[PDB]
Homo-oligomer: A and B are copies of this chain.
Amino acid sequence: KDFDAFVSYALSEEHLALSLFPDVLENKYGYSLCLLERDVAPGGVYAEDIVSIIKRSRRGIFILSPNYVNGPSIFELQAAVNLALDDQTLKLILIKFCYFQEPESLPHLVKKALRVLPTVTWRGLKSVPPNSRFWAKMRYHMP
């Protein structure tokens, strides 16, 4: 394993994933994150790229939103859930970025994980300071 946590995502979601997570967890608290766009080689087969970085990651961190659960992005959480039932060194954490209604024919096991996995509610401006409840819960769930 080569990454503390892999960060999957659909201010904004994108700002929280790509600027805020590495700012706090990497640049301030020294963890080792994986972002698709930074750590993987362009081109390539996206299905393997994710199964690979999942296999080299200690946690999974999923920023849930309506755009996530109704888009192609949900491919990433399914793989994580698949790979997690084989290895439980892999611990998955959801993040409630905003309300999302959950879709109606998500595959069996993805519905299942939504029902039991730990969620940290993202609460906007309050959550942004590095000493916030949000990051506190994030750090608690890191290796």
Please list the residues of chain A having a beta carbon within 8 angstroms of any beta carbon in chain B.
43-48, 50-51, 70-76, 78-79, 82-83, 107, 109
Contact yes or no, A82 B51, CB < 8 A = no
Stoichiometry (number of copies): 2
Contact of A74 among B43, B44, B72, B79 (CB under 8 A): B72
Contact yes or no, B45 A83, CB < 8 A = yes
Chain B residues lying within 8 Å of A43, measured Cβ to Cβ, are 82, 109
CB-defined A-B contacts under 8 Å, sample of 11: A43-B109, A44-B82, A45-B82, A46-B75, A46-B78, A47-B50, A47-B76, A47-B78, A48-B79, A72-B73, A72-B74
Chain B residues lying within 8 Å of A46, measured Cβ to Cβ, are 75, 78-79, 82, 107
Contact of A79 among B45, B76, B79, B107 (CB under 8 A): B45
Chain B residues lying within 8 Å of A79, measured Cβ to Cβ, are 45-48
